[PDB]
C-alpha cells in the first residue's frame, strides 16, 4: 500500500 504521507 501507500506510505503514511503519500498523496
Amino acid at each position: 500500500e501507500l506510505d503514511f504521507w503519500a498523496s
Epitope: 500500500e1 501507500l2 506510505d3 503514511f4 504521507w5 503519500a6
Partner: antibody, heavy 132, light 108 residues
Framework: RITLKESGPPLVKPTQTLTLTCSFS??????????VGWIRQPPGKALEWLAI???????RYSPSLNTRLTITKDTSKNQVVLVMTRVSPVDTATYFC????????????????????????WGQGITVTISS | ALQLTQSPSSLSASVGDRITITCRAS??????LAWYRQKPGSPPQLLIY???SLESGVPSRFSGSGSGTEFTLTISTLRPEDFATYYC?????????FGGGTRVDVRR
C-alpha cells in the same frame, strides 16, 4: 540533538524469541507525525527494512517478516520495542533503529512533507548472532 | 514488491573525481527517495532526502536529482571519507525498500 541506541541480547538460539529495544532522546513519540523504524544488515549484505511505528500508533511491517514481527512503543519511557519470534541463523545481523521526521509546520500547521522522505538519524546498531 | 536497482554495484575512483550513482525503481516513487553513505562499522548517514534536498550538515559536494523511477546521486569532488558504500531508499510504498548498494573504492 536526536540520538537513538539499540539494546538487547547479542546471542540468541534458533526458534527463540528476540526482543530489541530502541531508547532515544531529543524527540518524543508523541510529537506530530514522528516515526521510529527498524532496519537490519546481515554481515557483508545490504540494508533490509523491517518495520516502523508512528506517534499516532500506526504500524507497518516488512511483508516477508510480518508473521514474526511485533513493534510497539512506550511513549513515556521514550522506547520502541521490536519483537521477532522463531529466529533462525539467517536472522544474524546488525539491527538499527532510526528516526523519521514529521512534516515541517508553521504555527502548528504542516506545510512541507519533504522532510519525511528519509530516516535522518540512526543508532550505532546492535550485533545479534543466532546460533544454538 | 517494488524493486530498487542501484548502478553500478561497485565503482572505482580517485580523490577529486566526480562520480554519479544511480537508482531505478520498478514503479514510480515520486520524490520519496533518500541517499545514504555508510562507512564500515558505522551506521548509514543521511545525505539527501526527498530526492534532491541536501540534509543539514552534509557537505555541498553531494547532490541528488531525479523523480519517478530514476534517481542519481553525484559527488562532485570525491574526498577520502567518500570511499564507502552508498544506498538509496524508497519511502513511497510499504515496505520502505533499500537498494543493493554501491561500493566506492580506491582505483588502482
Amino acid at each position: 540533538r536526536i540520538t537513538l541506541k539499540e539494546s538487547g541480547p547479542p546471542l540468541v538460539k534458533p526458534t527463540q524469541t528476540l526482543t530489541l529495544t530502541c531508547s532515544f532522546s531529543g524527540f518524543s513519540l508523541s510529537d506530530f507525525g514522528v516515526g521510529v523504524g527498524w532496519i537490519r544488515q546481515p554481515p557483508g549484505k545490504a540494508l533490509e527494512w523491517l518495520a516502523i511505528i508512528y506517534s499516532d500508533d500506526d504500524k507497518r511491517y516488512s511483508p516477508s517478516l510480518n508473521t514474526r514481527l511485533t513493534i510497539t512503543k512506550d511513549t513515556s519511557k521514550n522506547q520502541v520495542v521490536l519483537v521477532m519470534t522463531r529466529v533462525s541463523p539467517v536472522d544474524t545481523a546488525t539491527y538499527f533503529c532510526a528516526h523519521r521526521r514529521g512534516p515541517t509546520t508553521l504555527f502548528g500547521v504542516p506545510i512541507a512533507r519533504g522532510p519525511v522522505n528519509a530516516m535522518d538519524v540512526w543508532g550505532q546498531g546492535i550485533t545479534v548472532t543466532i546460533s544454538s | 514488491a517494488l524493486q530498487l536497482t542501484q548502478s553500478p554495484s561497485s565503482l572505482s575512483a580517485s580523490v577529486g573525481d566526480r562520480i554519479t550513482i544511480t537508482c531505478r525503481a520498478s514503479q514510480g516513487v515520486t520524490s520519496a527517495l533518500a541517499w545514504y553513505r555508510q562507512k564500515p562499522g558505522s551506521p548509514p548517514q543521511l545525505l539527501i532526502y526527498d530526492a534532491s534536498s541536501l540534509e543539514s550538515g552534509v557537505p555541498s559536494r553531494f547532490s541528488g536529482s531525479g523523480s519517478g523511477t530514476e534517481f542519481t546521486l553525484t559527488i562532485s569532488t570525491l574526498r577520502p571519507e567518500d570511499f564507502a558504500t552508498y544506498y538509496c531508499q524508497q519511502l513511497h510504498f510499504y515496505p520502505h525498500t533499500f537498494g543493493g548498494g554501491t561500493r566506492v573504492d580506491v582505483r588502482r
